[PDB]
Amino acid sequence: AAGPEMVRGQVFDVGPRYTNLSYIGEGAYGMVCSAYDNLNKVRVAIKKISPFEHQTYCQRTLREIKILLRFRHENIIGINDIIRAPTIEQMKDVYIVQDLMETDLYKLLKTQHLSNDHICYFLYQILRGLKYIHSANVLHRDLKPSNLLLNTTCDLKICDFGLARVADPDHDHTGFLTEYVATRWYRAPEIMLNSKGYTKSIDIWSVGCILAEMLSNRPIFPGKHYLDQLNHILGILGSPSQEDLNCIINLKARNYLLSLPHKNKVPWNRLFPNADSKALDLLDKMLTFNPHKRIEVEQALAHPYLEQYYDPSDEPIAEAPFKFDMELDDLPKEKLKELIFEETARFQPG
Ligand SMILES: Nc1nccc(-c2c(-c3ccc(F)cc3)ncn2C2CCNCC2)n1
């Protein structure tokens, strides 16, 4: 495509190697197009981003590239290549290339009903991927159907680590009604109560939500706003026990819970009468109110529902658990640009 190829009025400079573009979507420094990788003879997915004007966007870009490049797993999308100018001065945009995944669980569910065998396989892959992520001491933090890529062969890959953090269980407590950025419907109850979401159990809850969703094609706790989300959860799980309340020390959070009328638990087999009993048993253990009593990823994999797939020797863990040296977003966009430039250097044809 002549000098710089063009896509819907925007320059999509993916050089020679990648051709036959095609628009897919675009929300900010994020326009995605599928192209043809002349080198591997396969159409890929490419995302154009320009986060250098804003320090924040530089943080999510740096952080996610590092994670995604460090991670190597069959159930986590990998970066196949990264395009950028040869000089930091000339680098305005950055193109990241990933395998082309036709669809995702969000689109699948808004059209198809899944058999129990597909839900099982999908769940297996989700957890197989999460076990690796967690083994690297990283928390995804934004797991939801739209963040689970799927190809024509049922192959599932977790993507979107823009909100991922290095686990930090000790510094997880915060006040009641503390703002959160992760997608509302899949947020664990403790996030609206006292958690910063720096604990692994936060991802398991999201997976539990995805499970319920696969079972009924509808989001289980579709809260309209912050506190609505919580009443949605309590509506089905019912009022928290004394025990689980005695854990919540943040006085305000506990008093809020106590002020609420008593609500009984709604049986799962009632919510999902077509569901498989083993599935609903694992769902129960995932959607546990108390984070400390919530099942772990490895325990989930070893659950009877996933019996036909479970194979610990075939469920790899990270070789090098993560450590974010520039942890805590205190870096100017300048320094961040140098790090991104440096992090993407390995793909340079120079
Ligand atoms: N692998 C793949 N395949 C198809 C689409 C996407 C993709 C990208 C993206 C990100 C980084 C990158 F380097 C290349 C593409 N951003 C959003 N989505 C989709 C993710 C699921 N819902 C609709 C948009 N990713």
Q: What is the structure about, briefly put?
A:
The protein contains 11 helices and 13 strands.
Provide the CATH superfamily of the largest domain.
Answer: Transferase(Phosphotransferase) domain 1
Query: Class of the largest domain in CATH?
Result: Mainly Alpha
Helix content: 25-40%
Find the structural class using helix and strand composition: alpha+beta
Number of strands: 13
Strand content: 5-15%
Would you identify the CATH architecture of the largest domain? Orthogonal Bundle
Distance between the ends? 22 Å
Number of helices: 11
Shape: globular
Q: What is the CATH fold-level name of the largest domain?
A: Transferase(Phosphotransferase), domain 1
PDB class: transferase
Keywords: transferase, serine/threonine-protein kinase, MAP kinase, ERK2
Assembly: monomeric
Entry title: the complex structure of the MAP kinase ERK2/SB220025
Structure description:
With 350 residues, the protein is an alpha+beta fold. It has two domains: 2-100 and 330-350, Phosphorylase Kinase, domain 1 (2-Layer Sandwich); 101-329, Transferase(Phosphotransferase) domain 1 (Transferase(Phosphotransferase), domain 1, Orthogonal Bundle). Helices cover 33% and strands 14% of the residues. The protein has eleven helices and 13 strands. The chain has helices at residues 55-70, 105-109, 116-135, 201-216, 226-237, 242-247, 251-259, 268-271, 277-286, 297-301, 333-343; strands at 6-7, 10-11, 18-19, 23-26, 31-37, 42-49, 79-84, 94-99, 103-104, 138-139, 148-150, 156-158, 165-166. Strands 3, 4, 5, 6, 7 and 8 form a six-stranded antiparallel beta sheet that branches. β11 (148-150) and β12 (156-158) form a beta hairpin. It binds ligand SB4. Residues 25, 32, 45-47, 77, 96-101, 104, 146, 149 line the site of ligand SB4.
